Structures are given as structure tokens and as C-alpha cells.
Amino acid sequence: IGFDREMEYIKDYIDPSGVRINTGIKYHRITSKSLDASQKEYYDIDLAMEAVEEHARDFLHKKESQARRLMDIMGVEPVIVAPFDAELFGHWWFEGVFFLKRFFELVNESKDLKLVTASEVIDTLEEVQIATPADSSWGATNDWIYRHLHEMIERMIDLSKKYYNSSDPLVERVLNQMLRELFLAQSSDWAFIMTTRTSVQYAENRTKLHIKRFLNLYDQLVSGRIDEEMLRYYEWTDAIFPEINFRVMARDVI
Amino acid sequence: MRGKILIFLHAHLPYVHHPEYDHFLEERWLFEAITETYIPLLMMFDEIEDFRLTMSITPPLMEMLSSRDLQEKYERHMEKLIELANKEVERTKKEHPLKHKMAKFYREHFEKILNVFRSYDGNILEGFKKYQETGKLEIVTCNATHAFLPLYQMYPEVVNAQITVGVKNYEKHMKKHPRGIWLAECGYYQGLDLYLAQNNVEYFFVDSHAFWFADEQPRYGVYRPIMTPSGVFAFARDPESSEQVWSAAVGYPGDPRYREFYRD
């Protein structure tokens, strides 16, 4: 309705800038494969529930079928690992948690299938093979950012060792915020993100912002001119791990 | 009898204060203005035997020059620059002799500048204040934020507050009420002299069109001030002494013997 409702009606639920955005109250169903979004029909939550009921039994029958085939080929119970982005359930797909609930209840009734958590399985399994996993990920210039990351990590390590035994709580606050800044600049989100309406823009702006904040602190530290008001500004805006200790960076490796 | 020459310099920069960063791009404008213009004026007032000059120092610019975090940043900028000056006097030694010679001029000059800045404990307003006390310099205020007042004429509260805030801000730094004011862009609309009178302002500056287009033109044109009915004196720009005389395209600064700005 933030795109549909009249501007005077909708003004103080969109952006203070006056730009149209999503409100969270939405009235249409997907309707069809049409590219003409104006032809979309109104949402009926009862039909939507009928869809989840069908889909949840589709998925159930697929997992039972897969289980039985695997038991017969394996001779032990398969553990079927199925990870999803959380926001896929309820956010991208409004009915997702409803689906999750129906699928759980169905699996609960199933004679072919059990829901397990991952810690239940490590606590229960007696035969498990030993193996070493290959380099991998679940995977999908611009190198001013990289040489800066390189120098920040290298510098962060130096200073954490250099001030390992310091008891100066100002230097410590500074080093602690440097690490936060460094970590904040490392967010994968800012790099090859899972940003919805993100666009490589707020993102590389994020990265550089944290790089710059880190270099500011580095400069004040290295030269005696710690600027306490700026540091407090940084502590406030970039407040992530209050309990952090820069000394994590001075530990051995290998 | 002798003709009277009134040279007026408008010294303004927007308030740009970014204490969240350690070097910010638009804080360098201030540093170049201090280095290139404000301190060399000070040096010139000191060196010359006698002068008479009127200038504005706008409240945004007074507020920046007095800010003792900017003074610290400027001092550190000036040292970075004298360090570069030195790197340059050696690197130039086997290059062109003009170029070598300039690098040494630059070293001595920058040292001199930072030294004047230190003479004043880094508040150069103290230097300008001291020349006002002699009567050789006259410093007028400006509206608080260099807003263009004719844009806001329908909002007399913001207009008059623009004026008063400037006036008080000047008092704070200068320890004296301002007598004259420079309006941003000489933006003047009819009635504004009243607020100036309410603010105890004695004189302002207008564009030539303020006299030419008056209901009856002033008898001596732009070559004598007028007094508004309210008792406020207005000084109109000599259009024969316009911007063009200082144009690089058509005026003195465009002379081939002068230092090129866009090579660095």
C-alpha cells in the first residue's frame, strides 16, 4: 500500500524523504506468471493455506521417498541436511513459517521420518567415518579495499602484540575499536552480499567507512594524539562487541 | 581634494566541521584559505607602513578559526607541508633552477606562515582584532549563516535572527559591537534596513542596481553613500571596479608571468 495508497494518506508511513517504500501490509497474491503486475488479484489467505497443505505433503512425500531409498541402499539411517536462509520463511515467502509448521507436524506423524537437531545426531551416532573435507563453499579491480584490508590486519597484529601487556585503558579502548572496525569491514555482506535491495553502493560505502575509521584510530595511536571525542563517537555508532579484547589478535597460530 | 578609495574584502567560508574524521577533504579549503590568504594579509598589514581596508569575517569563518581543534589540525597540516617542502628542496636540486629556487621559497614561506600562526597561539582572529584597534582595518559582520536574506523575506523572524546571531557572534569574538554588515550576495530587499537599525547596524553594502533602480536615483550615483530614512548608511559597488578586473580570462591575474593554479 506504500506504492498504491494515495500520497496524502500514506505520507508518514513511508520514508521521511517522501519516497515510496514497503509498509508490510500487502493485499495481492502472485496470481500468475504475468509480467503485468497490475493484473494481480487480491490475496485470499484460505486458498494460501490450501497451497501450504499441498506443498507440505509434497515435500513430506519427497523426503519419505528419499529416506526409504537411502535406508535400503545404505543400511543405516540417512541424515538429510537441509539448510535455508531464515528470511526465506515468512519474509520472502509470507506463508513460509506456516509451511514449516505443517511440515514438522507431518514429519512428526510420519512412520518413515524423524526430525532431529544436529547436536542430537552427534550425541547419538556410533558409526561415523573419518574424513577431511575439501576446500569449499555454498557459493555465489575493487582492490583498494584489499590492500587496505591486508595492511589493517598486519597492523592490528603488530599493535596487539606491542601492547599485549599495556594497562593503559585508553590505548585499550582504541585497540578494541580498531578490531571492531576491522571486523565490520570484513562482513561478507559488504562484498558479495545477500543484500535484498542493497546494491553494491551502501555496501562498498560501508566497507570504506570502517576502513577509514580504523585508519583514523591507527593514526592517533601511532602519534600520541588519541582523540577521545572521536573515539567515543566510534564506540557509540560501532558498538558491536562491548566485551571484545584486542588481545585475541596477539595469539599464536598454525 | 582627493578621491576616496574604499577596498572591501569579503572573507567567508561555509561552516564545515567534521570532527568524526582525522583528515576530511573539505576541511582543506579552510587550510588553504588560512595559508594563501588570511595569514599573508596579516603579514602584509605588519610589513606595510600604513593602509586602510574594510573586510568581512563572517560568523561561520570566525567560528572555525577560533575552534581550537581546527587550529591543532592546521598546525599538523602545516608541518606535513613543511616536511614536503624539504623533500622538495632536495628532489629539485638537479632539476630546473627556477623549480629548485621555488622549492626553497616554499620552505621559507611555509615556515614563516606557521610561525605567524604560532605568534597568535593559533587564533589569527587576535591578529585581525589588533589591526581593527589601530583603525587601519575595519571588520564588518555578516548574517549568521550567510543565508541569502531575500529568499527568506516572508519569514522576518529568521531574517532578523540571522542578523542578530551574526551581530552577537561578532561581539563575542571581537569584544566590540560591529558597526557595519555585509549581507550575503548583497541580497537586500526593501525594509531590511529597519532590522539592521533595530540591530544597531550603522552601514551595509549593496549592488549598484540598488541605487540605479531606486525611485529617484541618488544624485552622486554610486560614488557617495546614501543614508536610509532609518539612518542606516548604504555603500554601493563601483561597477567600474567589478569582478572582471580580477578575471583570469580578461584581467590582471591572467598575465602569463603569474603562477598557474592548476599545476601542482
CATH number of B94's domain:
3.20.110.10
Among candidates B46, B71, B12, B201, which has minimal Cα distance to B131? B46
Contact in structure between B41 and B24 (CB atoms under 8 Å): no
Sign, Cα dihedral of A112, A114, A120, A121: positive
Domain span at residue A173? 141-254
Q: Do B22 and A227 touch (CB under 8 A)?
A: yes
SS (H, E, C) A206-233: HHHHHHHHHHHHHHHHHCCCCCHHHHHH
Q: How many domains does chain B have?
A: 1
Mutate to test the interface with A, among B17, B18, B20 (most CBs of A within 10 A): B20
Alpha carbon B6 to its chain's center: 15
List, in sequence order, the alpha helices (H) in B49-134: 59-66, 68-91, 97-119, 125-134
Q: Do B22 and A233 touch (CB under 8 A)?
A: no
Among candidates B180, B190, B182, B181, which has minimal Cα distance to B150? B190
| Cα(B236)–Cα(B224) distance, integer angstroms | 8
Distances (CA, A) of B197 to A252, B85, B164, B179, B234: 75, 50, 11, 11, 12
Distances (CA, A) of B3 to A61, B6, B223, B224, B235: 104, 10, 10, 11, 15
Distances (CA, A) of B52 to A78, B36, B49, B183, B194: 96, 21, 11, 21, 29
Q: What's A227's domain CATH number?
A: 1.20.1430.10
E strand segments, chain B: 8-11, 53-57, 137-142, 180-182, 203-206, 226-227, 233-236
Among candidates A31, A135, A15, A138, which has minimal Cα distance to A82? A138
User: Could you tell me how many helices (H) and strands (E) chain A has, helices first?
Assistant: 8, 0
Distances (CA, A) of A153 to A186, A230, A250, B73, B218: 10, 22, 11, 27, 72
Spell out which residues of chain A touch residue B21, defining contact as CB-CB under 8 Å: 212, 216, 230
Chain pair A-B, CB pairs under 8 angstroms: 15
Residue B19 cell numbers, joined = 570532527
**Residue burial A59-70, b: 16+ Cβ < 10 Å; e: rest:** bbeebbeebeee
- Name the minimum distance, in Å, from the CA of A141 to any CA of chain B: 24
Contacts 24+ apart (CB under 8 A), A184-192: A184/A210, A184/A238, A184/A240, A185/A149, A185/A152, A185/A210, A185/A211, A185/A214, A186/A149, A192/A140
Spell out which residues of chain A touch residue B19, defining contact as CB-CB under 8 Å: 227, 229-230, 233
Chain B residues with at least one Cβ partner in A under 8 Å: 19-22
Alpha carbon A223 to its chain's center: 37
- Name the minimum distance, in Å, from the CA of A2 to any CA of chain B: 34
- Name the minimum distance, in Å, from the CA of A234 to any CA of chain B: 8
Q: Do A216 and B19 touch (CB under 8 A)?
A: no
Sign, Cα dihedral of A75, A79, A82, A83: negative
Q: Do B22 and A219 touch (CB under 8 A)?
A: yes
Please report how many Cα atoms fall inside a 13 Å half-sphere around the Cα of residue A200, on the Cβ side. Answer: 3
Among candidates B237, B209, B215, B213, which has minimal Cα distance to B225? B237
Name the closest residue on chain B to residue A236, using Cα atoms: B20
What's the length of chain A?
254
Q: Do A233 and B20 touch (CB under 8 A)?
A: yes
A1: Cβ contacts below 8 Å, ≥ 6 apart? A10, A23, A25, A26, A27
Interchain CB contact of A87 with B (< 8 Å): no
